[PDB]
Write a protein that binds this ligand. Structure first.
Ligand code: NAG
Ligand code: NAG
Ligand code: MAN
Ligand code: CA
Lengths: 404, 188, 119, 393
């Protein structure tokens, strides 16, 4: 039968954190659920207010010869007057009216919309992308006057994207694969036939590629501040809560673009022998399409056409290939652990890194499908939000592939 | 015999994810917490848990969706002049006039998001026993910009939103956990 | 409750003192914004933005096989005085992200399946 | 079967680097993960802050009589006062008041984007044309007018490029091969097509290189003490190599393959397989993403589609092939401990050659062979073998 939630409670309680005025708890999830038995929705960690038992330490964490920004960021002083936004607050630039100039003198230039969203956070729970830990609005005073992209017209590359480029590569694949098999006999008359189809198609419309600077990185005021709130004490579910809501990783490698793919799988059998009269038929049919990237008007127009006997109009692809200019999706990337962005020049930062890695190991182990029960027959285990299960498009049935 | 036919589709507009700390709530929500008693006042705690929610989506997917299961056993029509490839061809044809005929009946409709005009046109074609045209799906897809629905959600219980500054915060959160635990037994 | 050096709001909230002048409805019915008309300093440096209708409803309250009639417990009218923005690729319009929503990614993705098994 | 990520322990801490105020050790990958076991990510180098145990040296590293620009890059007064802004941070207005006009006295001339991207970095991981180590906006105060490429219009060539020769080539290589046998019957097909267009070749200057302010200052930031993490961070953000020369152009390639057979008592069998692929690179989107599709189908092409596609390579090339130079050759001497940086970039690249070796992953089943990807050793196989390890069929 199916399996409801299993857990054990906190079994611990922290002392009071002096500067944070709070205390923490975290609990052992045993099994979230299996085979659509009811989910463990209840919290992995929780916290309580305390009037602290001792004074907080000196709260300032000034980087020294760098300007301490009104956001709490740090940067080389002179830029605070230049019309580049260094600070995570434009009005620190407004404050120093006495040396206003932009990083380029005479250039007329665009913001790279590929660069803005570069270095997405990612969560391994589905390889979900998340908005950038990275600032991507600051130029480090660099003029950096690129002119890549199909319109061949200038854009500025913000300080974190060491590389961003707009490569115009494409690829397409076709396979169509068919079989028919027949067996017949007499002594009693017997006959049978089988028929098989397999298809694969894909096509890739690459737009561009990126890498993020692994030193002197400039971060969203929120990410650099959302390190301050951390417990310092390996409170498992709290570091799990940062990993849940800034992601397990941040990435830099790109294939940005549009993509399509298809499969057909069809497999068919019929058998007869012949007073006595005996027969059987077995048949499984499955056809699927994917589209990603580009604008609704053309990308959603294409998505269904792909499945059919319908020969696609070449200018529909050309309209889609144009629209990927506006609306890329990240087709492939290189992951890096999120802790590499908690910077040097902040109090207890190494201990915060130590706890972030241990909490990634906890992330890896508590979602581990090794804990769930074996799928029946030819199947294998699947994980979904709050449940293990399995499913089998192969003449098996039930939420654990139990029957045929 | 066993037989089913399915057609399924997603239209995806965006991914949302939300905070687990430094959250800012509506004042009317934290007022409803300030009005809770310190006791396990079960009738009042079930009142709150239905005055805002039992759970919340720490993330979800904005878009639209369809599932259009053909309960129709193929042989109900296939005895009359239509091959398996032809009824497929008609659904997505000269051998009968299937679009004119009473032969297609038992197609289910589930359709989520978009402007009612287009959702209705798809439903009306399906219950008449007729396929929708590609024109109709793109018109529907254009309209999800005005009226999204959540395709799937990842869930957590509402007591996580209770601010740490709340007078009796841990006691209220523990009583909301005690209340959430009873729902699972309150309903059969 | 007592926001210290920061500002105590009408229906019970704290708004950081820098927020109050900015135009963002920090404290409901614009009751943050009483008089700061000598220094009404915006979150965005005269950039064109419109408020994300797809995210203002995000974070719905949920029940076992149900969802709320009144939009959210979260306040998607709050922005911490930041300008941080996502955009619609389909109309090329920029939207501010509500500070509850840690991420908006607008993606165009269409997936379609036909299936039968028979015995 | 599936195999998880494995790593060494963390090596014992470095001493505190005096000027860098940090301390680290490292952790080698043993196995990246294999056959859809738990894939690796976790850091090979990580570091802790330190209040230093001894004084830092004097911080200035100026090349003698050279002009100290706001970048802190070595330059001479002819490059600044001639208005050319060579020194890397647009400072020329500070340097002269009288006749500072650019080296092209009256005949001021456009730049080239195809020239600017010259000397892409490259990395053995992913083989990416990483954005240039070179500062191709340095012109050495030269007017340096080419008029090359098909736009039939003048452009200034960058200092670090010896020439960007638009030595045009267009080549199609084609082969087909087919067989039939009968006694039963068998039929066999192979098709190969490639088309290459080379718009031109760039060569990077082998002495007197001007590097980007970031490249030079991001080597100033090195440990000085042979610590993998900071050397690897410079590699992974600037390349294992630079393209010391390479060929800008476009390319297409295609295949079709077919293999077909056909063969009281009633016995018979039929067997068939199909494989078709298309590749395109370079050129502007409309023409390229027409043609790569168009050529996969049998369609007898309009020659004007080839003319439009390959014309658009003048505006949007891809790097077809290049000469890799080991990256450390770009630490300019007349910088403090310049050679010790070279030495340990080379030792870090040798350490790169150690852990990313696929050879130590376990054997794929049946007719397969192993490949390495970001956190997975894996295989793909002939004869309809199946699964990521080819254990079944
Ligand atoms: C088998 O079914 C056929 C259907 O036409 C029928 O004609 C035949 O008599 C049956 N044979 C028997 C009775 O086994
Ligand atoms: C061929 O097929 C028929 C079908 O009934 C079968 O009876 C016979 O045994 C098979 N062998 C022959 C006739 O070659
Ligand atoms: C020392 O190295 C070990 C690996 O054996 C880590 O687990 C630990 O966190 C520390 O970095
Ligand atoms: Ca600035």
């Amino acid at each position: 039968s199916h399996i409801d939630c299993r857990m054990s409670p906190w079994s611990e309680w922290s002392q009071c954190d002096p500067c944070l005025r709070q205390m923490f708890r975290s609990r052992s999830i045993e099994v979230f659920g299996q085979f659509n038995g009811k989910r463990c929705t209840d919290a992995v960690g929780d916290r309580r207010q305390c009037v602290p038992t001792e004074p907080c330490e000196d709260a300032e964490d000034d980087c020294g010869n760098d300007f301490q920004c009104s956001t709490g960021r740090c940067i080389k002083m002179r830029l605070r007057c230049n019309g580049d936004n260094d600070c995570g607050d434009f009005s620190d630039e407004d404050d120093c009216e006495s040396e206003p100039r932009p990083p380029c003198r005479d250039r007329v230039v665009e913001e790279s919309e590929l660069a803005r969203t570069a270095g997405y956070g990612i969560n391994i729970l589905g390889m979900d992308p998340l908005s950038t830990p990275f600032d991507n609005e600051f130029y480090n005073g660099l003029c950096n006057r690129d002119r890549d992209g199909n319109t061949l017209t200038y854009y500025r590359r913000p300080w974190n994207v060491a590389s961003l480029i707009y490569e115009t590569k494409g690829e397409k694949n076709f396979r169509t694969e068919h079989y028919e098999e027949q067996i017949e006999a007499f002594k009693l008359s017997y006959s049978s036939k089988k028929e098989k189809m397999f298809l694969h198609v894909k096509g890739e419309i690459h737009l561009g590629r990126f890498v993020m600077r692994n030193r002197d990185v400039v971060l969203t005021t929120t990410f650099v501040d959302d390190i301050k709130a951390l417990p310092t004490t390996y409170e498992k579910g709290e570091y799990f809560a940062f990993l849940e809501t800034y992601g397990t990783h941040y990435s830099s490698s790109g294939s940005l673009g549009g993509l399509y793919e298809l499969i057909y799988v069809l497999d068919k059998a019929s058998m007869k022998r012949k007073a006595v009269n005996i027969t059987s038929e077995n048949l499984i049919d499955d056809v699927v399409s994917l589209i990603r990237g580009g604008t609704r008007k053309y990308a959603f127009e294409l998505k269904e056409k792909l499945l059919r006997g319908t020969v696609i109009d070449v200018t529909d692809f050309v309209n889609w290939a144009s629209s990927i200019n506006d609306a890329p999706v990240l087709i492939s990337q290189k992951l890096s652990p999120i802790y590499n962005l908690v910077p040097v020049k902040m109090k207890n930062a190494h201990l915060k890194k130590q706890n972030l890695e241990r909490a990634i190991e906890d992330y890896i182990n508590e979602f581990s499908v090794r804990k769930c029960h074996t799928c029946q027959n030819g199947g294998t285990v699947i994980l979904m939000d709050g449940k293990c299960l399995c499913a089998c498009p192969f003449k098996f049935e039930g939420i654990a592939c139990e029957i045929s | 015999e066993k037989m089913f036919l399915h057609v399924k589709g997603e239209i995806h507009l965006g991914r949302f994810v939300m905070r687990n700390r430094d959250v800012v709530l509506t004042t009317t929500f934290v007022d409803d917490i300030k009005a809770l008693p310190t006791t396990y006042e079960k009738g009042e705690y079930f009142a709150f848990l239905e005055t805002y929610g039992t759970h919340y989506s720490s993330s979800g997917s904005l878009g639209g969706l369809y599932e259009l299961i053909y309960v129709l056993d193929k042989a109900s029509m296939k005895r009359k002049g239509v091959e398996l490839k032809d009824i497929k061809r008609c659904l997505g044809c000269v051998k009968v006039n299937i679009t004119s005929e009473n032969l297609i009946d038992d197609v289910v409709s589930l359709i989520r998001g978009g402007t009612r005009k287009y959702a209705f046109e798809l439903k009306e074609k399906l219950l008449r026993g007729t396929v929708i045209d590609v024109t109709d799906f793109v018109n529907w897809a254009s309209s999800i910009n005005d009226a999204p629905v959540l395709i799937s959600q990842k869930l957590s219980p509402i007591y996580n939103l209770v601010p740490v500054k709340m007078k009796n915060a841990h006691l209220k959160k523990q009583n909301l956990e005690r209340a959430i635990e009873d729902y699972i037994n309150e309903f059969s």
